[PDB]
Design a protein around this ligand. Structure first.
Ligand SMILES: NC(=O)c1ccc[n+]([C@@H]2O[C@H](COP(=O)([O-])OP(=O)(O)OC[C@H]3O[C@@H](n4cnc5c(N)ncnc54)[C@H](OP(=O)(O)O)[C@@H]3O)[C@@H](O)[C@H]2O)c1
Ligand SMILES: NC(=O)c1ccc[n+]([C@@H]2O[C@H](COP(=O)([O-])OP(=O)(O)OC[C@H]3O[C@@H](n4cnc5c(N)ncnc54)[C@H](OP(=O)(O)O)[C@@H]3O)[C@@H](O)[C@H]2O)c1
Ligand SMILES: NC(=O)c1ccc[n+]([C@@H]2O[C@H](COP(=O)([O-])OP(=O)(O)OC[C@H]3O[C@@H](n4cnc5c(N)ncnc54)[C@H](OP(=O)(O)O)[C@@H]3O)[C@@H](O)[C@H]2O)c1
Lengths: 475, 475, 475, 475
């Protein structure tokens, strides 16, 4: 078995200490990492391994039973202090990596837990000095991947000029979730969902990502990006790609991402008449943080028109999806947390039940709870021939971040955004973002803890989604 | 509201006193019958209303709370004695009905609770004497409807020579069942079951009717008919009609039965190579009645070759169902009681999961514990890309006999066998029955309480059904 | 071979002498008739077989070569004079038929070449007297089959109370045409036309029946009926049934007509907003009869609002045809003679040719120059990838009337109107005709020899047909 | 307009003088070339422009009408003598091309009319020296592209290590033909061919490429490759890709070639039991060249087992084409010249015409006499409901080589083989070629001018093509 080096650049970061070190700790605890794996930190701060332990222990969730295993894990941890644009520091880091046991032929896995501003310099210096000559070299890149098409293209071209596509792992936490990964099996392993997954049967597709909390203090970081860049551009667009994607030639990462980019290439730029933007305000009847609006945050610049809610309608102009509205819906400070995929089917042609039938709906809920159910019509128990709404419910381990790190280790790139997919997403959403920043349109206020602006429901009804509300469900 | 007269002719019979009088009582108690309803008996034996009450109270399921309603219901009861082929007795019956309040313009409902041996004279005399000149006159005919094509045609032609098709209600108890009626709503009120309900997606259709008990003493009655005449000719064939039926022009009884006859007309005569026959033997390890075989029943003639189990393969040679085998499976003294419709779908074209996928199966269980579920593949919780078997479960008043009698009262003929339906069924099953009764083939023995002969499973596998056995289910 | 008697009542009429006698003559000349066939005329006016021959020979197309065959044909011809409501005259007719050679056991074929005003009396007398007790008895009934639903139902009930549905042959010469009969073979014998023959691929259906001549003197006959009763109710509706009908269980006449009536039962009543009516005026620049308008006919009542042109939109509200408009267009004094069926298909979904693609069209031209072609896109010969409109063309005996008479002889009722089909057709068109006859709407005038009112084209464009005009065809 | 330099490497070759110089001559004559276009030759043998004239005007198709334009064409011609592996000679060529007017900024188009033995050196030295710094540089590479997967991978890796994929134009003279390019418009611009172009409707696909002549005096050259490498690996495989490919996202060359390689990736390696090989023998009753067999050629080594005929069956294991056999048929010295795409459709489900219907066939004849027709069933003019086979027939400039060169000039790579396409084709056909070369199986002899071995027809029948032979066609 080959040896591996997990280089954590910016190991002093909050993201590092709270998510990366605990994740590799759990992976080593479960015996999932390669046996010969060395964790090497790298940041400008003068820190030590004890200095690390002190900062990472309360997030480690370490019970006293496995203190020996924790000591064994932290034995292989090491830290190098250096600057992100200092060739001498990068040479020192490379020398230290070669100083570890069998470090010259080790597989190098650099995790860039850094702000995007230093990504170019870090990648350039890594490619210059710290690349292994025998093993592979894979780089984990964190969002944001630029703020528009031009900046994203600049960063992507800089990274791609040095590293191959198989060496770049743009990490998205949402792509590793079980229901998100179950979408391909649900679609392509079942005959029941095959013939109906087209424009001849589906009336509209609704993709939802709701959060019940606001900016909760760190509103200044969210102000410069907005909800479209936060959620719509990546989460909902990956959901759309999985829902609308053709069947791949195989389960290979290249084939899956080829289908995803092919679907993305058939989407036109978003227009402002298909977009509803909202910004949450305080709830006087609420408790705690519900009473504070988006602008009530001191870190948020005054007079900000950043949208905390967005509802856009996309169209995939291909054979399978021509004319089917794809409604992307997300927001913050909403009434509940939910990540959902909903397919509303057309009315049954030649209805013989006197307009009593409702549209079939297939729902794939990703969170809070995993649930795949289809709403369908069934005969009402009684005397007359009246259908009523019913439902078929689907009846029925490392977490998503751990599986993503294991995917980087094992070379599976199907859960990571490719360069062409990123370019297509940015080209889809860039004219709208440019118009928004140029004109500063006022978002529609909505009360903290509500469902959002009513204009979103109006847009859904206009594009084709008919909400009934008469469907009653009991657990 | 017009007056209705329910003439239970044969009121001294076991079927009458055990099912018809209690059903009429329950319908009257719930108020489902019209407010002006008179029940008139007719049989050779000389009884009275007191005698009928005495012999029907044990099966009455009455309570002391509504003894007043009991006495009110028997207040409208009456009885005319006489011969079933006596013009004077039928004149007396007609005169009694006229002497009843509003009895000349009253609707007359004749229930023929008599052996088919007298049906000819009974119906002829009813038409000649007891026909009402104002209200409608409908006759309820009980099984058997003949033993083969020729006898059934004789009886049906004689009955139709007197009564119109809208006056004949050939009753079978299973068409009034909840899932049997829900099949049409499931098929034609839902978009998700439309495009897949054809030969391009469905590999085979299995219609199952299993019972856990044998002839239990009355084997002489079953010896004259056999399992094919008892179950396949009516129950499983109605199931096949409902499953393979085209969408009717409307929910009218004429349209529904027209579609059913159209489906029946596309089925060729049953061939012997597609039939597996079985006769149950005793279980040495059984408990009580289960230890006696079919030939171990006094009433059963020695050397009888009457099959208690049958498994035939039918084909609906039309555009929707060409090449799809319809497997009709029924038997007695089997391992369980079950009426079920199972659709097995084809393999997903262009498999990308390395042959790990299993065929989708839609199951509609009429009884026991009615349920609709689809066996389908879902992603196995883990790291690798492997599907696993799961299912979507459908989640969630007078019974079939009173619903059928209410249908006769209302004039709905949807759940009653039409003359052309009967003719098509008999022309389908008549060459096989004649061959069986001529060559006297020996049925394959199977132990009381088993799944039947293994030749049935071999036939299912040959025609295309592939059983897996790897699908494990827990409530 | 059994002997046949062909009774032509109204043998002195123009229809008889110009179509029936020549047709029987040609059938006998070609040997298509049964060997022992006798032709018996019947009319009030007294004449002889010599008079019939003298008055019918110009239309006989007789040549000196077959003079002996002509004398053999007239050796079997006979004439009987009598009233249409005289039992004595009908007894004399029966006696003549019986005195004919093997006339008591012959097959009797009554052609009612009479106005419908005496149809009831003729049929009643036929049933009372002239029925054959050994051979079959079939009557041929000519249009009009009533003026509305009520009159049609009255006449149909009178005829059906005396004759079975298998004895009534309501003759419509349009159903006997080659392309009209080839519609079924084209639809149900070809895999290419199967999957596309539904609402998911067809945008609209146009049924056209144009005539280039006006009433031509006999406008008084046309005034009380109009174009809807003349052409729409029978020719266009039969073509609609054949185009929209489901696949029959077999090629039996009963199955085909069951499918036709099943389609007719799915069509709602015609609404006035889906109807364009027109009445032609004279062409001042025309030559001959083209200069006279509809009202210029002296027999036409002054100020008549009878429409010589109609364009209605019908909808077949079933699974296959839900939402597809069926445009029925017929008119007199138009620019050409044409009987055509046109299916315009939907635009290709996800078009990759920059909107250069035109809708596919399947055209079945019944007359003149019966041709089947489909307009399709092909690559333009050149350097760029531009599709251009092209087409696939179909490439290379008794006529319709003799075919229909032979069908009556051999007992095939496929190309004849059934009672339920007639009832559904009048159900569809009766409220509109009543509204027209009550409100007396003024038809849109149009010039003799034109394409009709432009409101018809506007209605087609509104309901969904898009005329291109860029399609160029060269013979 | 930019200036272009068309460098003809190996300009003294037979291919050059017979096809390339006439093609650019015609392009310049018709004003399709760029206005500033200089043609430069380069070969080891010391010729001049006068020698090029003396050797190329026999095939120039030049008439005295355009003699001035001819002399203007060779006014822009030039010739440079040098070795194909000489850095000094290639520097001299670069100096000449710079000395051309505006040759420093000119677009460079290197046509490699050379044997593949020197391709590596020529490409490496072209990249080293003769690459423009402002204009683009495109290289046209001729077949063969290696003899198997390993050699093809070697050559492709060597070429791609220097030139980008957008700079390499692997020329296949077949992809530029009119009928070949119309396949994509026929499939994706027409709704009539959409729903039926799948496995649910198509029984088998036959791809044919027949020649009526053997290997006239060049059997020694054909011997080293064989029919599979000559025709099957490129022509028939490109035809298969065009027939079976999914709809591209757009008409971009990259999208089209991605679809093509995606289809290629779904094909497994060819098995020997699906391959029929043949080698033509002399015809004793033939005339002239037909009397000599393949081994009668003195250039053919004695005992050669090279196949001049091949019939293989391929399968595209994806959702659209799973189970449909793709029969590739090619051979030399056959009965005719023909290249054709034939799609035989399945039998119509639920036949109601008593097994008289034949399978529909869609035929796209690339050459000779480009035609598209669909064999289909139509009613036989007569008395009975009897279908008979008919056909819908498609109805009534630079050549393929000129259009391919113009495509290179315009930068269109749609009709050129990509690296992944070549690699996938060699992967498909390499195990079979290795097995043939190792085991040396004897090809089945067939007579010059016949249809080939009967084993090919047997294999077609076995895989599913049912030849009828009852279809009659007249022009
Ligand atoms: N649970 C069931 O029993 C059951 C279930 C399914 C279907 N059925 C069908 O329902 C029908 C009702 O018959 P059943 O079950 O009630 O049997 P049943 O009791 O033997 O016959 C009903 C009554 O008819 C009279 N009867 C019997 N045999 C007769 C004969 N040869 N001729 C004239 N009258 C005769 C008898 O009364 P009188 O002596 O006064 O004439 C008898 O009480 C039968 O055809 C049976 O096939 C019954
Ligand atoms: N080519 C056509 O004209 C044509 C085409 C299609 C359908 N039809 C239908 O076929 C039927 C035949 O009519 P037709 O065209 O032949 O015109 P017709 O001459 O008026 O009818 C034919 C015979 O009907 C008799 N007749 C006329 N008026 C009568 C009346 N009030 N009472 C009793 N008998 C009367 C006459 O016989 P006697 O004078 O000897 O009593 C006449 O010879 C019509 O209903 C017409 O709608 C005709
Ligand atoms: N019509 C066709 O023949 C045809 C058709 C399709 C494809 N192709 C492909 O195109 C390529 C062009 O070859 P060709 O048909 O033109 O035959 P060719 O005349 O023998 O080769 C072309 C020129 O290349 C030079 N040459 C020949 N052998 C050479 C060698 N071992 N090493 C270096 N240079 C050599 C010669 O010029 P110098 O002696 O002056 O250097 C010769 O005139 C062939 O490989 C063939 O696969 C040919």
């Amino acid at each position: 078995s080959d040896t591996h080096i997990f280089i954590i650049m910016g190991a002093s970061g909050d993201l590092a200490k709270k998510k990366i070190y605990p994740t590799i700790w759990w992976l080593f605890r479960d015996g999932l990492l390669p046996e010969n794996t060395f964790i090497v930190g790298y940041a400008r701060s003068r820190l030590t391994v004890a200095d690390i332990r002190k900062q990472s222990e309360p997030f480690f969730k370490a019970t006293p039973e496995e203190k020996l295993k924790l000591e064994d894990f932290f034995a292989r941890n090491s830290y190098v202090a250096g600057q992100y644009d200092d060739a001498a520091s990068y040479q020192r880091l490379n020398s230290h990596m070669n100083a570890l046991h069998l470090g010259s032929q080790a597989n190098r896995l650099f995790y860039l837990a850094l702000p995007p501003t230093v990504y170019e310099a870090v990648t350039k210096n890594i490619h210059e000095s710290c690349m292994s000559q025998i093993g592979w070299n894979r780089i984990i890149v964190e969002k944001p991947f630029g703020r528009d098409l031009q900046s994203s293209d600049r960063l992507s071209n800089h990274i791609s000029s040095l590293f191959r596509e198989d060496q770049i792992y743009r990490i998205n936490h949402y792509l590793g979730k079980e229901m998100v990964q179950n979408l391909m099996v649900l679609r392509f392993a079942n005959r029941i969902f095959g013939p109906i997954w087209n424009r001849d049967n589906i009336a509209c597709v609704i993709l939802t990502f709701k959060e019940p909390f606001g900016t909760e203090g760190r509103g200044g970081y969210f102000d410069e990006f907005g909800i479209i860049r936060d959620v719509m551009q990546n989460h909902l667009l990956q959901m759309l790609c999985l829902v609308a994607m053709e069947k791949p030639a195989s389960t290979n990462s290249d084939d899956v991402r080829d289908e995803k980019v092919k679907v993305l290439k058939c989407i036109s730029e978003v227009q402002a008449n298909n977009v509803v933007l909202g910004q949450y305000v305080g709830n006087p009847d609420g408790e705690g943080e519900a009473t504070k609006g988006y602008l009530d945050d001191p870190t948020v610049p005054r007079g900000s028109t950043t949208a905390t809610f967005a509802a856009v309608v996309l169209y995939v102009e291909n054979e399978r999806w021509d004319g089917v509205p794809f409604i992307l819906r997300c927001g913050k400070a909403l009434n509940e947390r939910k990540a959902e995929v909903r397919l509303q089917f057309h009315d049954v042609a030649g209805d013989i039940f006197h307009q009593q039938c409702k549209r079939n709906e297939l729902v794939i809920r990703v969170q809070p709870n995993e649930a795949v159910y289809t709403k369908m019509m069934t005969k009402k128990p009684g005397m007359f021939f009246n259908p009523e709404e019913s439902e078929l419910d689907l009846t029925y381990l490392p977490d998503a971040y751990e599986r993503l790190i294991l995917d980087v280790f094992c070379g599976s790139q199907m859960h990571f955004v490719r360069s062409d997919e990123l370019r297509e997403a940015w080209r889809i959403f860039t004219p709208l973002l440019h118009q928004i920043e140029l004109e500063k349109p006022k978002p529609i206020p909505y009360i903290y803890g509500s469902r959002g602006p009513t204009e979103a429901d109006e847009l859904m009804k206009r594009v084709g989604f008919q909400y009934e509300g008469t469907y009653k469900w009991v657990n």
